[PDB]
Nucleic acid binder design. Structure first.
Ligand SMILES: [Zn+2]
Ligand SMILES: [Zn+2]
Ligand SMILES: [Zn+2]
Lengths: 72, 596, 186, 135, 187
RNA sequence: UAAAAU
RNA sequence: AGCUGCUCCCUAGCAUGCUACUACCG
RNA sequence: GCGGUAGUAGCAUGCUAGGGAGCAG
């Protein structure tokens, strides 16, 4: 199960990269730090906390039309 | 080099190279297009001809794939396959394509030459993707025809810009217009060498002709000019994004009580934010433009882009915006073009400003909150897809009047278009309903309003402001001094002279003409700055002058007449010989010696 | 291989030799049936081999073109397929904490900064309209990301502080609606 | 100054779903995912290179070294080497980065070609009497 | 593989063969006309196989000389490029003070490390954290390496300009924070 | 025979 | 954007070797 | 009917070259 959230983190970070998020050193650094810690995390719940903490970052900008992807 | 079937969107690798525009076709579709048409040459990852040198059997239905390669009937290898086989044609994914029934009208499109409204009337009512392809091949046929015009050379030089030219005997001579450009070649022996781009315009007499150049090159006698062609990119965006709704306004944010002068329209303002897009039909430039800018004001933080096709249109619009907007405004309009000058305010290229104005063909490739196309009664589905491709926003608003002036689309010469079929949104307005409407004049004298409502409208308008100083001398049309078939009538100015002086204050008016060259000659025995009826449709004036050519079909066009006479605020006058219309116009005509 | 023309000749020679060695005829007659069948094998393989080579070329061409196509296919669609796979994995993952903010963002609850986790630490979210607030802002505790936040500094798009108590459906149609809320965890 | 990062690895889903479907990765299983493609931000290169602070000037005992070196030598009796002529070298894979600043032109093959079999010999025999710093 | 003196011998021998075979005459006829596919084709084996290898070898010679030509072309290009790089590199340094310190050498050779230290015209310093900045290029000018440097133009990790005002103690957690400071040799 | 393109 | 080392797969080419049948002389 | 010189196609070996991918330090 935990494998799921880990792989999810990987995909999400890749996305953030594709969005050119590395043009601001502070933001990119926080993101990478979070992602690393996730991949080393060994509990079930702290993973989710860091996960949403990250995902917020993607939520920030308006490059990803959320409603469209939410077509289920 | 695969794609989607223009009729089934199935995977394939074929293109009817015999058809002009090389569209992708599924197997069955290809078989049907080829079996029912002189169109025979099919292209794939490679051409389909017999690879044995000399055999040029290019009717695919005769050919055979050999070992890897293709072959005729005779030179075929001992073992082979027949290509055009079993109601299909062999191509990639052959066993997957579905095929459908749109082949008839398809070939109808691909085979017409845009000479009779029927092929149009179908062009505007087929499926959207098909509609696209139709517009593509239309513009392509236009371009190809443009090539048919003759060639021009120099005969002798007269001045820096005064010249005598020599035309090709027995060839169509294109007109002298700012919308034509010629590459200049001079040849040494050897050394057929381009010299630059040169436009033209008729000087004071024949065949002295002026020309604007790219560089200060010295002219010669062994020189000539070829009108420069053009290309046409393929399109892929739909004409209309699928219409939608929402349950609550999103994206945009009203103010509070600011600018009540725009009151009633707020109702429309909400529902506009409530849809994906919408339309609005309005008599000339009344609520039109007015309402657009009002809405723009309504949602302040909303990034908004205005655009149209007519340069003078977007210009009048940008000035009307200047009348009320933060500046904080630009019209990023024209790079190294603008043969006619336009905007005078701000940059042409940063795309930072919230309220950006430009012309369709010169648009960037950007995003925004909403966008307001204008004057759809003139554009073609081609341009609509173009703008939907270059831009991308949330709420769209199209505005126009299906009684105005459509795209010239010169190629058609047999019959006439019902306005309903000018393009898609034209239908949409004329079909189900214009979703929002406006019915009152805020710009025109009441008398001309009465006249028009008596004519093309069904007596369905009202306004304010009446008199005065209006007439319609049905002055016989003098000599049609037509340089090219573009009309000129100097004795028409032969009475303008009688109002070149009698004019007490009618000195700052604008003159309007059915034809471009009679307009230019108006600029010669000048009275004032003039314009063409097309280049109108966007601005109002206190006084306006109007003389006409003969009663030619282009001239007596009721719509041209309407949109012309509907550009004035207090004073107006129009001069046709006129067998009937002066019976319909309500002013006070006079006689040549009776001008006060 | 069978239907080849040279196979007809080889078949004729083989059948003729079959009939000859069946009748058990002379030796001088097979001197042909050997000098006429060896050639059949000769004039025959020198064509079954030649088509065979082409038959391998066809493969080693198709097997290349296929992958060459689907290669550039897959390097055309990353910043598209990637996102949808992401959201697929999200939906499958199923965590109410996430789904909450995800729906909220479909609505508009975009945070202007990283969600913190320290018991202190500030949070800045956006709210478009009234019901959003009412569906979220309840007293002075804020329920976001399935967490409890203390509401401390509401401010509208005019960048002016606005009284919390003033926020209600009646007078709400008077506010610079993009509201910027700030809070702290429990 | 420039900063380089390290993008994260890309994920292969369908294979992962497959592996799940056949019963792997269930909680408490013996084997699980522990190796991955860690990412790196911008202060990576320098903050790594700094690790040379662990390098100290150390004076190693000399007398015992003068004998351990003998033993080590004895460990290498059964071999043979020496100078070789340029036409005899072997370079598997001729395309690797060419250091600085030759990476401003091309890889190795460009250089290993534009020189004769003597340019190499001349150069080699030139180092045997002079010193050439590098980067 | 068509116009050869062997091809014509083939054609005429085969013509005589067809003639005297349609005649169906002597056994000597059969002998002299089998000595045709047997004697008039040895030449046609050699010259219609050897000549097939002449083309192959000539064409491979052509392609290898093509490759060698392109090779030596690249050589000229790259050597021109590196010569240009050298000649443009030196064209930024020949201040007289360099020559001066050269003349001060008892021999004319000096350690590399001290050349830019004393003779550079512009210094760049990389700073991690605020306290550290305070303990160095704080203020608008400072000293270093027995010289006086003046600050001008300061950027960040994102390579955006920043003024000295913002560099407070508590505003610092708002910046891409390993700054680059470029200072000039003040006299 | 009317507009009008990195 | 390295130094090697092992391994698999694909392709070409050369030469050998070998096979045999087809052609010349013994 | 054998032996030596010329073809063919096939087979085996190997050697080179070229190209793809993975593991170890
Ligand atoms: Zn066709
Ligand atoms: Zn189809
Ligand atoms: Zn043929």
């Amino acid at each position: 199960k935990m494998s799921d959230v880990k792989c999810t983190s990987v995909v999400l970070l890749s996305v953030l990269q594709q969005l050119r998020v590395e043009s601001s050193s502070k933001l990119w650094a926080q993101c990478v730090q979070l992602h690393n810690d996730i991949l080393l995390a060994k509990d079930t719940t702290e993973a989710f906390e860091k996960m949403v903490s990250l995902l917020s970052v993607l939520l920030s900008m308006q490059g990803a039309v959320d409603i469209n992807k939410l077509c289920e | 080099a695969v794609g989607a079937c223009v009729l089934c969107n199935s995977q394939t690798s074929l293109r009817c190279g015999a058809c002009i525009r090389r569209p992708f076709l599924c197997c069955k579709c290809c078989y049907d297009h080829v079996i029912s048409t002189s169109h025979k040459l099919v292209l794939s990852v490679n051409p389909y001809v017999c690879n044995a040198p000399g055999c040029d059997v290019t009717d695919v239905t005769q050919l055979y794939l050999g070992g890897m390669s293709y072959y005729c009937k005779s030179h075929k290898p001992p073992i082979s396959f027949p290509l055009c086989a079993n109601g299909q044609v062999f191509g990639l994914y052959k066993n997957t394509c579905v095929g459908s029934d749109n082949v008839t009208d398809f070939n109808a499109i691909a085979t017409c030459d845009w000479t009779n409204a029927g092929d149009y009337i179908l062009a505007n009512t087929c499926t959207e993707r098909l509609k696209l392809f139709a517009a593509e091949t239309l513009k392509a046929t236009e371009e190809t025809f443009k090539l048919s015009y003759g060639i021009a050379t120099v005969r002798e030089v007269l001045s820096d810009r005064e010249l005598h030219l020599s035309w090709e005997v027995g060839k169509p001579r294109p007109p002298l217009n700012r919308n034509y450009v010629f590459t200049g070649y001079r040849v040494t022996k050897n050394s057929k060498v381009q010299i630059g781009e040169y436009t033209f315009e008729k000087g004071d007499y024949g065949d002295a002709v002026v020309y604007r150049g790219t560089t200060t090159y010295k002219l010669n006698v062994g020189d000539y000019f070829v009108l420069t062609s053009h290309t046409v990119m393929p399109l892929s965006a739909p004409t209309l994004v699928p219409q939608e709704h929402y349950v609550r306004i999103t994206g945009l944010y009203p103010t509070l009580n600011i600018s009540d002068e725009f009151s009633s329209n707020v109702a429309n303002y909400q529902k506009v934010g409530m849809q994906k897009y919408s339309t609005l039909q309005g008599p000339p430039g009344t609520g039109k433009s007015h309402f657009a800018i009002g809405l723009a004001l309504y949602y302040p933080s909303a990034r908004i882009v205005y655009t149209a096709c007519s340069h003078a249109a977007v210009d009048a619009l940008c000035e009307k915006a200047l009348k009320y907007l933060p500046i904080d405004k630009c019209s990023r309009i024209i790079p190294a073009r603008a043969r006619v000058e336009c905007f005078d305010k701000f940059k042409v290229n940063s795309t930072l400003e919230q309220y950006v104005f430009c012309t369709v063909n010169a648009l960037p490739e950007t995003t925004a909150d909403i966008v307001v196309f204008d004057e759809i009664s003139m554009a073609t589905n081609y341009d609509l897809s173009v703008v939907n491709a270059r831009l991308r926003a949330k709420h769209y608003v199209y505005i126009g009047d299906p009684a105005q002036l459509p795209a010239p689309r010169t190629l058609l010469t047999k019959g006439t278009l019902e306005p309903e079929y000018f393009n898609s949104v034209c239908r949409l307005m004329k079909t189900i309903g214009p979703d929002m409407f406006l019915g009152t004049c805020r710009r025109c004298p009441a008398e001309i309003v009465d006249t028009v409502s008596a004519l093309v409208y069904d007596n369905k308008l009202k306004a304010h402001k009446d008199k005065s100083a209006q007439c319609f001398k049905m002055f016989y049309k003098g000599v049609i001094t037509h340089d090219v078939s573009s009309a000129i009538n100097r004795p028409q100015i032969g009475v303008v002279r009688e109002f070149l002086t009698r004019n007490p204050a009618w000195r700052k008016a604008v003159f309007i003409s059915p034809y471009n060259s009679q307009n230019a000659v108006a600029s010669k025995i000048l009275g004032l700055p003039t314009q063409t009826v097309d280049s109108s449709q966007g601005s109002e004036y206190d006084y306006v002058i109007f003389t006409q050519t003969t009663e030619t079909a282009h001239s007596c066009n009721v719509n041209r007449f309407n949109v012309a006479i509907t550009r004035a605020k207090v004073g107006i006058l129009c001069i046709m010989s006129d067998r009937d219309l002066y019976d319909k116009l309500q002013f006070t005509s006079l006689e040549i010696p009776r001008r006060n | 291989f069978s239907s080849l023309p040279s196979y007809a000749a080889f078949a004729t020679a083989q059948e003729a030799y079959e009939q000859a060695v069946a009748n058990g005829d002379s030796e001088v007659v097979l001197k042909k049936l050997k000098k006429s069948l060896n050639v059949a094998k000769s004039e025959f393989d020198r064509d079954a081999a030649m088509q065979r080579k082409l038959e391998k070329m066809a493969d080693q061409a198709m097997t290349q073109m296929y992958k060459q196509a689907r290669s550039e296919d897959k390097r055309a669609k990353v910043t598209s397929a990637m996102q949808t796979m992401l959201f697929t994995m999200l939906r499958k993952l199923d965590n109410d904490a996430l789904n909450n903010i995800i729906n909220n963002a479909r609505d508009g609850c975009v945070p202007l900064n990283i969600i913190p986790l320290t018991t202190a630490a500030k949070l800045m979210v956006v709210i478009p309209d009234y019901n959003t607030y009412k569906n979220t802002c309840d007293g002075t505790t804020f329920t976001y990301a399935s967490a409890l936040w203390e509401i401390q500094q509401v401010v509208d798009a005019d960048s002016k502080i606005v009284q919390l108590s003033e926020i209600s459906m009646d007078n709400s149609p008077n506010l610079a609606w993009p509201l910027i809320v700030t809070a702290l965890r429990a | 100054v420039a900063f380089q990062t390290v993008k994260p690895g890309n994920f292969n889903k369908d294979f992962y779903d497959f592996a799940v479907s056949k019963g792997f990765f269930k909680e408490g299983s013996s084997v699980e995912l522990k190796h991955f493609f860690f990412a790196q931000d911008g202060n990576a290169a320098i903050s790594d290179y700094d690790y040379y602070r662990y390098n100290l000037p150390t004076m190693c005992d000399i007398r015992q070294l003068l004998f351990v070196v003998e033993v080590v030598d004895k460990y290498f009796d059964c071999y043979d080497g020496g100078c070789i002529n340029a036409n005899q070298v072997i370079v598997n894979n001729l395309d690797k980065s060419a250091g600085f600043p030759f990476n401003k032109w091309g890889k190795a093959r460009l250089y290993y070609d534009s020189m004769s079999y003597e340019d190499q010999d001349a150069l080699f025999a030139y180092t045997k009497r002079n010193v050439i710093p590098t980067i």
